[PDB]
Amino acid sequence: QVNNKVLMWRLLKLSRPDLPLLVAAFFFLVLAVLGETLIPHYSGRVIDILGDPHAFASAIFFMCLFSFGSSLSAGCRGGCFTYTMSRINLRIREQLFSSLLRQDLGFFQETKTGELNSRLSSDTTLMSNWLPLNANVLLRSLVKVVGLYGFMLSISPRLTLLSLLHMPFTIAAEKVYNTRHQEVLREIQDAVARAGQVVREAVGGLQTVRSFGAEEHEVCRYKEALEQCRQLYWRRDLERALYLLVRRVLHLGVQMLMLSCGLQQMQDGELTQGSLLSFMIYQESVGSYVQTLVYIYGDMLSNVGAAEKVFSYMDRQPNLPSPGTLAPTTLQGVVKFQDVSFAYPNRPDRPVLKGLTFTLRPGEVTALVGPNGSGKSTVAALLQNLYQPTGGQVLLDEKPISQYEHCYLHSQVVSVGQEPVLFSGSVRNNIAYGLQSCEDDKVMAAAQAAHADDFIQEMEHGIYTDVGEKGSQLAAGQKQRLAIARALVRDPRVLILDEATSALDVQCEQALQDWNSRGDRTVLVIAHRLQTVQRAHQILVLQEGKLQ
Amino acid sequence: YSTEL
Amino acid sequence: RRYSTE
Amino acid sequence: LGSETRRLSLFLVLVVLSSLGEMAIPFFTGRLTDWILQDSADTFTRNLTLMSILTIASAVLEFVGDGIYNNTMGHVHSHLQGEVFGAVLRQEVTEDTSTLSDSLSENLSLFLWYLVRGLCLLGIMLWGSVSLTMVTLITLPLLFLLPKKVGKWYQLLEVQVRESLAKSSQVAIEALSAMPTVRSFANEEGEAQKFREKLQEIKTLNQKEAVAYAVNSWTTSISGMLLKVGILYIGGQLVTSGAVSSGNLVTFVLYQMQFTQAVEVLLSIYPRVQKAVGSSEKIFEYLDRGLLTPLHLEGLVQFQDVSFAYPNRPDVLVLQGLTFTLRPGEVTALVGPNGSGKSTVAALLQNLYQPTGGQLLLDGKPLPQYEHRYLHRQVAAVGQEPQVFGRSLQENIAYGLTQKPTMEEITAAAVKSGAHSFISGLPQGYDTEVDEAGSQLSGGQRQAVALARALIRKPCVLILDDATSALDANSQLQVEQLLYESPERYSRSVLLITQHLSLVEQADHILFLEGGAIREGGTHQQLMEKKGCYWAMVQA
């Protein structure tokens, strides 16, 4: 199809900045091929001469020179192509990663992380072998074949006809064997995955199996899966050996037909001994290249398909709204909800909000309560310009929230997650996350605002220690107080709390809800109980998507 | 066969 | 059996 | 591996014969050379026939030997995997054995083939010409030292590059797995910068990797050319001297080339064999680390000085001198401290672990003396954590059954447990397959499925607990009503560890334990209208 041509053109254009390396590689390749083609001719002429010191010396010197030059070029070309491959891989990975960060949250809510890892780890390497490996081997292999056949036709115009007639019986066999192998491999892979799924299922439901004593049935099912896979293994192992036997028988026959015909032609008087030796060497060598050409051309299509699969991810269009530009100097902090209704694109036509309407004020600490199927999370999220409301509008200082700059908005308004997430960086990097620059004096001030210093300050070097992977070494309560300190380091104007008091101290919540970051800054707290009532200036319940 | 880069 | 880089 | 000691021996014969059959193309070739300088066709025809026959026989024997070896190795691999999984499941990794066995088998086969080939070639060369063979053996080690040294360095650089790529991959996957927070803090440029900084380190290693590759190629080519020239010179001088003819030299040259190829293959193959052999010992070490006939039970149980503990040590005992007893046809409940771990008593009722002291005989027979096959289908009940397997619903609701129940029986069991409505409402009837590990299940559906799986076997004892905790209030009320409305209180023993006092209200004799033994008990009405634990809990 034309899609393959489009992909090939895109892959050519991706390698545009590698001209100075590709030129040297394609020069050394030609030099090496031309050097390796001509050696047996000089070997045959030496043999004929032996049966005049000047000609002998000239032939020996030329053979040695060609051998050495080819040996050097065959290494220079490989080095250049390896470097080019590495450069292309490192170039494509960065583009693939930097294009994904701009996607909407629905794309990540839908796509499994395994697919992203597969694209960013395996296919970006398979598509990088197209030019340095496939298009290199195919070129030299084909050229070498053309040169060898030209020399063979020059030496004897009759003996070459037999090889020209014999070649299809090799090409067809190689094609058939490759076609069968490429599907046997994937059948084996599917069987192995299905077999592993049984062990995964047994691990998942271990308690019930031990309670009912059903091990003797899970073992039987696993044995059935193994016996299903063994047959495919045996079939592949048999096909290989059959192909090897056929290849060996065919070659011996060709050689004996070549040897007999060549001897009968020499004894007539139309050929010499060195010419027969050179022809035999050429005819022996041609077959390996003929087979490897088919192998490489068959392999190239997998790389093309992997390239298509990778490129299908970085060409997809996002669903973000139009970018904003506004950035006032002093936000008042008044937030109003007007007839807000929302439906998740992943599960559409099942609204969670039905005409929600309320108003927030700087000092009016407003608390939201009521389960509503955990719908309190949704109203918090869409106040940060993470999702767009399908109905109504949400506005900041008499302007829509979507009209403000992305970088500016998330400095005035910040929220704490319901389940805090921490990154594998240091303590200082996690507190100052997202900031261009910070000073350790502010970090101490931010940490002391959440009383987390009682744990941080016992730790060696202070704030420069490495936090465990995704906060592995921190306790549940400790992570809560670290996530809070990540907020007041930014000096927010609007603050949102997702039931932080459920794990953190209630008095700590009151201090966080009454400090300088909350004295005249709008605070919205989400509570699963009536605990927020002790300070809320405007309590608001909402159920079934409708406010109380 | 004979894949040397 | 004979070897094969694969 | 011993059980296949005969077949492998047969293989170990055939390969040898094949290794002698394929040495007829070089030898006779030299013979043909010695024929072309001394010019009948009879000897030519004889040589041709011998060469063709020997080559064909060698090919056929190699095919047969390979087939036999592969057939045996498949069975060995399957048996090993089955045993490993059985041991792992009963113990309470699998893919490691699967990914190791194929590599080990392939590398061992190649090693054996090429070792035998090399031995045969060396023997025939030594019989041919002693002096040239000695020269080749002397010059082999000196020309096979530097390429290994360069190759090790190149391999180290390659593995370093691959490890760096893997590190960057995670540096990226970790960033991409927490997108809501990154978007909330507007920190995408930071993630891009971190990824770029990670790639800037591999950019340095790639250059030296390429340089090492080029140097390795040059060294290999130079050694390959030098080796052949060194013996060609001495062979030519010997032939010119007149001690040997040209055909012997041609045969020796071909034999030397094949011998060098065999040695190089063996050197390339050996490390993988060593690594796989070393790795299999870990799997080995991980793997290596009768009852009376029951007829019927009336549901009468009792314990005297019963004790049980955790498998880690007998000092983690959660009971000490317990005296639990549930009359047949009477339903009772137990309570106690959260940290007391009384739930293990239910496990003690299921004969999962033998008592640490005393006896727990029930229905006039010892608890661990009955047959395990028939006891597990008459004393089990719904588990503490309801779940649905990946099998079909008609099979999920009857797991662990020796005989598959009929459709009418399954429907009746579901209706008695209230799961008939869930089965009817599910698409495609009972033939629908539930999601693996309860991926698409629901609390009420899971509770109904657990109740159906418990009641399908008509148990003689009930150990249902925490089933209503995961279930809804309506489902809990329905379960309680079904339990209370059973014929003559189900005419069997129930010792449910309820989580709500609503079920314990109708208890025949409630009880509460403390300090590893039952510390209080009596009628529910008496307990709730006195100084008992139930009244204190209700008032508090």
mmCIF file of C-alpha atoms in Angstrom, chain A residues 108-263:
data_model
loop_
_atom_site.group_PDB
_atom_site.id
_atom_site.type_symbol
_atom_site.label_atom_id
_atom_site.label_comp_id
_atom_site.label_asym_id
_atom_site.label_seq_id
_atom_site.Cartn_x
_atom_site.Cartn_y
_atom_site.Cartn_z
ATOM 1 C CA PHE A 108 -4.039 8.124 30.359
ATOM 2 C CA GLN A 109 -7.257 7.077 32.101
ATOM 3 C CA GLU A 110 -7.970 4.770 29.143
ATOM 4 C CA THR A 111 -4.587 3.531 27.894
ATOM 5 C CA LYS A 112 -2.849 0.888 30.003
ATOM 6 C CA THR A 113 0.674 1.731 31.173
ATOM 7 C CA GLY A 114 1.953 -1.534 29.695
ATOM 8 C CA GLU A 115 1.310 -0.291 26.161
ATOM 9 C CA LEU A 116 3.160 2.965 26.856
ATOM 10 C CA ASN A 117 6.123 1.061 28.297
ATOM 11 C CA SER A 118 6.147 -1.248 25.265
ATOM 12 C CA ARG A 119 6.157 1.715 22.873
ATOM 13 C CA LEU A 120 8.868 3.560 24.805
ATOM 14 C CA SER A 121 11.132 0.543 25.384
ATOM 15 C CA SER A 122 10.764 -2.042 22.595
ATOM 16 C CA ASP A 123 9.236 -0.604 19.412
ATOM 17 C CA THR A 124 11.432 2.511 19.510
ATOM 18 C CA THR A 125 14.388 0.123 19.136
ATOM 19 C CA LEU A 126 12.838 -2.098 16.459
ATOM 20 C CA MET A 127 12.052 0.913 14.274
ATOM 21 C CA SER A 128 15.624 2.198 14.737
ATOM 22 C CA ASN A 129 17.222 -0.767 12.917
ATOM 23 C CA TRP A 130 15.584 0.035 9.574
ATOM 24 C CA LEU A 131 18.357 2.108 7.978
ATOM 25 C CA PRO A 132 21.576 1.004 9.763
ATOM 26 C CA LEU A 133 20.849 -2.750 9.631
ATOM 27 C CA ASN A 134 18.260 -3.794 7.034
ATOM 28 C CA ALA A 135 18.918 -1.247 4.272
ATOM 29 C CA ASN A 136 22.656 -1.858 4.740
ATOM 30 C CA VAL A 137 22.747 -5.688 4.586
ATOM 31 C CA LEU A 138 20.197 -5.765 1.709
ATOM 32 C CA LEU A 139 22.259 -3.285 -0.424
ATOM 33 C CA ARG A 140 25.690 -4.988 0.005
ATOM 34 C CA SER A 141 24.155 -8.511 -0.266
ATOM 35 C CA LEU A 142 22.420 -7.668 -3.598
ATOM 36 C CA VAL A 143 25.484 -5.799 -5.011
ATOM 37 C CA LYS A 144 27.836 -8.642 -4.053
ATOM 38 C CA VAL A 145 25.493 -11.062 -5.845
ATOM 39 C CA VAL A 146 25.513 -8.946 -9.008
ATOM 40 C CA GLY A 147 29.311 -8.774 -9.002
ATOM 41 C CA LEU A 148 29.764 -12.498 -8.387
ATOM 42 C CA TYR A 149 27.410 -13.406 -11.214
ATOM 43 C CA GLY A 150 29.140 -10.974 -13.550
ATOM 44 C CA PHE A 151 32.484 -12.626 -12.830
ATOM 45 C CA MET A 152 30.962 -16.099 -13.233
ATOM 46 C CA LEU A 153 29.472 -15.167 -16.606
ATOM 47 C CA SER A 154 32.846 -13.767 -17.654
ATOM 48 C CA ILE A 155 34.746 -16.947 -16.734
ATOM 49 C CA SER A 156 32.405 -19.451 -18.404
ATOM 50 C CA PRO A 157 29.176 -18.549 -20.256
ATOM 51 C CA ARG A 158 27.875 -22.147 -20.101
ATOM 52 C CA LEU A 159 28.421 -23.356 -16.525
ATOM 53 C CA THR A 160 26.572 -20.347 -15.057
ATOM 54 C CA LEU A 161 23.311 -21.373 -16.746
ATOM 55 C CA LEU A 162 22.990 -24.329 -14.370
ATOM 56 C CA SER A 163 23.136 -22.061 -11.310
ATOM 57 C CA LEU A 164 20.705 -19.634 -12.951
ATOM 58 C CA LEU A 165 18.293 -22.544 -13.392
ATOM 59 C CA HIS A 166 18.860 -23.914 -9.876
ATOM 60 C CA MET A 167 18.287 -20.678 -7.919
ATOM 61 C CA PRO A 168 14.424 -20.701 -7.775
ATOM 62 C CA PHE A 169 14.392 -24.056 -5.961
ATOM 63 C CA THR A 170 16.364 -22.333 -3.187
ATOM 64 C CA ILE A 171 14.424 -19.055 -3.142
ATOM 65 C CA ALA A 172 11.037 -20.774 -2.846
ATOM 66 C CA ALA A 173 12.186 -23.102 -0.062
ATOM 67 C CA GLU A 174 13.648 -20.248 1.980
ATOM 68 C CA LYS A 175 10.463 -18.205 1.565
ATOM 69 C CA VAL A 176 8.240 -21.103 2.665
ATOM 70 C CA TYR A 177 10.377 -21.890 5.707
ATOM 71 C CA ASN A 178 10.432 -18.256 6.833
ATOM 72 C CA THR A 179 6.660 -17.969 6.392
ATOM 73 C CA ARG A 180 6.044 -21.038 8.565
ATOM 74 C CA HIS A 181 8.537 -20.000 11.256
ATOM 75 C CA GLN A 182 7.139 -16.480 11.637
ATOM 76 C CA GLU A 183 3.721 -17.860 12.609
ATOM 77 C CA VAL A 184 4.963 -20.770 14.731
ATOM 78 C CA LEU A 185 6.852 -18.258 16.887
ATOM 79 C CA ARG A 186 3.751 -16.175 17.619
ATOM 80 C CA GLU A 187 1.662 -19.283 18.324
ATOM 81 C CA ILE A 188 4.287 -20.352 20.871
ATOM 82 C CA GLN A 189 4.237 -16.882 22.441
ATOM 83 C CA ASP A 190 0.440 -16.918 22.772
ATOM 84 C CA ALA A 191 0.514 -20.392 24.335
ATOM 85 C CA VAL A 192 3.174 -19.306 26.841
ATOM 86 C CA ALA A 193 1.150 -16.232 27.820
ATOM 87 C CA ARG A 194 -1.982 -18.344 28.295
ATOM 88 C CA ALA A 195 -0.013 -20.786 30.457
ATOM 89 C CA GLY A 196 1.315 -17.959 32.629
ATOM 90 C CA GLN A 197 -2.180 -16.541 33.090
ATOM 91 C CA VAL A 198 -3.139 -19.709 34.996
ATOM 92 C CA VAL A 199 -0.334 -19.195 37.522
ATOM 93 C CA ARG A 200 -1.315 -15.533 37.845
ATOM 94 C CA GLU A 201 -4.944 -16.493 38.517
ATOM 95 C CA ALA A 202 -3.886 -19.087 41.093
ATOM 96 C CA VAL A 203 -1.721 -16.496 42.857
ATOM 97 C CA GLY A 204 -4.539 -13.944 42.862
ATOM 98 C CA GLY A 205 -7.051 -16.215 44.587
ATOM 99 C CA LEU A 206 -4.717 -18.208 46.822
ATOM 100 C CA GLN A 207 -6.783 -17.974 50.017
ATOM 101 C CA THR A 208 -9.886 -19.600 48.530
ATOM 102 C CA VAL A 209 -7.846 -22.387 46.919
ATOM 103 C CA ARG A 210 -6.151 -23.224 50.216
ATOM 104 C CA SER A 211 -9.482 -23.046 52.058
ATOM 105 C CA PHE A 212 -11.172 -25.474 49.653
ATOM 106 C CA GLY A 213 -8.104 -27.656 49.062
ATOM 107 C CA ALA A 214 -8.317 -27.403 45.268
ATOM 108 C CA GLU A 215 -4.580 -27.519 44.510
ATOM 109 C CA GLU A 216 -4.945 -30.889 42.762
ATOM 110 C CA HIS A 217 -7.137 -29.215 40.108
ATOM 111 C CA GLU A 218 -5.033 -26.098 39.498
ATOM 112 C CA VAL A 219 -1.999 -28.357 39.067
ATOM 113 C CA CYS A 220 -3.942 -30.375 36.486
ATOM 114 C CA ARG A 221 -4.924 -27.232 34.563
ATOM 115 C CA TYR A 222 -1.316 -26.017 34.539
ATOM 116 C CA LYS A 223 -0.156 -29.429 33.314
ATOM 117 C CA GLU A 224 -2.722 -29.228 30.510
ATOM 118 C CA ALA A 225 -1.362 -25.829 29.460
ATOM 119 C CA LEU A 226 2.217 -27.140 29.504
ATOM 120 C CA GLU A 227 1.240 -30.165 27.411
ATOM 121 C CA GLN A 228 -0.436 -27.803 24.945
ATOM 122 C CA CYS A 229 2.754 -25.736 24.596
ATOM 123 C CA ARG A 230 5.106 -28.723 24.276
ATOM 124 C CA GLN A 231 3.505 -29.812 20.994
ATOM 125 C CA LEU A 232 4.198 -26.441 19.367
ATOM 126 C CA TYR A 233 7.789 -26.588 20.611
ATOM 127 C CA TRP A 234 8.218 -30.051 19.083
ATOM 128 C CA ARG A 235 6.647 -28.990 15.774
ATOM 129 C CA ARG A 236 9.064 -26.077 15.406
ATOM 130 C CA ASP A 237 12.048 -28.257 16.319
ATOM 131 C CA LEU A 238 11.025 -30.818 13.687
ATOM 132 C CA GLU A 239 10.510 -28.259 10.913
ATOM 133 C CA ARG A 240 13.929 -26.825 11.412
ATOM 134 C CA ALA A 241 15.697 -30.128 11.097
ATOM 135 C CA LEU A 242 13.696 -31.029 7.990
ATOM 136 C CA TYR A 243 14.760 -27.763 6.348
ATOM 137 C CA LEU A 244 18.406 -28.392 7.247
ATOM 138 C CA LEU A 245 18.310 -31.882 5.719
ATOM 139 C CA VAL A 246 16.762 -30.595 2.486
ATOM 140 C CA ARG A 247 19.382 -27.843 2.231
ATOM 141 C CA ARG A 248 22.286 -30.257 2.723
ATOM 142 C CA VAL A 249 21.016 -32.716 0.107
ATOM 143 C CA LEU A 250 20.395 -29.959 -2.491
ATOM 144 C CA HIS A 251 23.917 -28.407 -2.100
ATOM 145 C CA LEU A 252 25.833 -31.722 -2.508
ATOM 146 C CA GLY A 253 23.847 -32.450 -5.704
ATOM 147 C CA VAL A 254 24.560 -28.968 -7.164
ATOM 148 C CA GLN A 255 28.313 -29.305 -6.357
ATOM 149 C CA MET A 256 28.562 -32.793 -7.969
ATOM 150 C CA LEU A 257 26.737 -31.470 -11.078
ATOM 151 C CA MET A 258 29.114 -28.501 -11.081
ATOM 152 C CA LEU A 259 32.217 -30.633 -10.547
ATOM 153 C CA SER A 260 31.282 -33.164 -13.228
ATOM 154 C CA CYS A 261 30.410 -30.531 -15.833
ATOM 155 C CA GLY A 262 33.529 -28.488 -15.090
ATOM 156 C CA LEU A 263 35.866 -31.464 -15.372
#
